[PDB]
Design a protein around this ligand. Structure first.
Ligand SMILES: *CCc1cc(CC*)nc(N(C)CC(=O)OCC)n1
Lengths: 288, 9
């Protein structure tokens, strides 16, 4: 009874869609729209609630970066505003550790953040923690073994192959081995002891390559590439498989959803989104 | 357009 939710995104303008995909039967459900359109946001889940964090509304009337945190309850199909972050964060990355949401990086106009802040749902409060060693927008974030990783991105001048890890009990960030490819706008997730980085943009092309970091060995290794090159894709893990959703391939706003099986090292097309889009926020929780 | 996202500008 778990669905893949996709929130927001962009196609002509930033979007307010909330749609949920059921891998068990291939269906899509359109649910309550976000109150404000946004692309470049991130999604996450804590205690059965879905959260939409940051992003920017790129509308016909202008660009507004978002510091918003909005809460969706599948039991009522209703969005509720939660406490806003200290600063707007477009092209943010988020990770959940021990019931708390970490918001990492992102931009506010020409400001590229290294700052990081943590949300406690029990108090509806954000607090700043140690900043990253590098400013990162279009950064991929994932959590493995209660450690937070920030991968790739763009620092205001260069696209990055670097990555770093936050150790919460020391409130400290440390660099990890850099990836073998420069990636800004990649999808980053965790699956079976590894941090995966899929797609993104290297400065010249949108990528179909995928590499994974084994935290025990400190190495990055390429796996099978996706069928579609994509940047600003959504990504999540569900029942031991990675799912990538949409993105931009330099020509089209993809509706493709591919699924990676780690046992066979293969990607397959599993469904199409209802319309092509980039910059979505994705997470997995109960059916509404 | 932004080559990373496809968005206008
Ligand atoms: C976002 C509109 C758009 C997309 C792309 C693909 C990168 N190119 C352009 N062109 C070439 C410039 C233009 O005329 O934009 C008018 C909005 N536009």
């Amino acid at each position: 009874g778990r669905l893949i939710y996709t929130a927001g995104g962009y196609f002509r303008q930033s979007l307010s869609y909330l749609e949920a995909y059921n891998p068990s039967n291939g269906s899509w459900l359109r649910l309550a729209d976000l109150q404000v359109p946004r692309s470049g946001l991130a999604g996450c889940v804590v205690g059965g609630l879905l959260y939409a964090v940051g992003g920017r509304n790129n509308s016909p009337d202008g660009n507004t970066d978002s510091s918003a945190l909005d809460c969706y309850n599948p039991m009522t199909n209703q969005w509720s505003p939660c406490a806003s972050m200290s600063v707007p964060r477009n092209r943010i990355g988020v990770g959940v550790i021990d019931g708390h949401i970490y918001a990492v990086g992102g931009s506010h106009g020409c400001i590229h953040h290294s700052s990081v802040e943590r949300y406690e749902p029990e108090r509806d409060e954000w607090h700043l923690v140690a900043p990253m060693l590098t400013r990162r927008i279009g950064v991929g974030v994932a959590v493995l073994n209660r450690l937070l990783y920030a991968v790739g991105g763009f620092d205001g001048t260069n696209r990055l192959n670097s990555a770093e890890c936050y150790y919460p009990e020391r409130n400290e960030w440390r660099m990890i081995t850099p990836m073998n490819t420069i990636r800004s706008g990649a999808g980053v997730c965790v699956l079976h002891n590894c941090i995966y980085a899929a797609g993104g943009y290297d400065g010249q092309d949108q990528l179909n390559s995928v590499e994974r970091y084994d935290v025990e060995t400190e190495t990055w290794t390429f796996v099978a590439p996706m069928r579609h090159h994509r940047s600003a894709l959504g990504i999540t893990v569900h029942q031991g498989k990675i799912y990538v959703l949409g993105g931009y391939d330099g020509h089209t706003f993809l509706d493709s959803v591919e699924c990676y099986d780690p046992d066979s090292d293969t990607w397959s097309e599993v469904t199409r989104m209802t319309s092509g889009r980039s910059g979505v926020g994705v997470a997995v929780t109960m059916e509404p | 357009c932004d080559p990373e996202t496809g968005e206008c500008l």
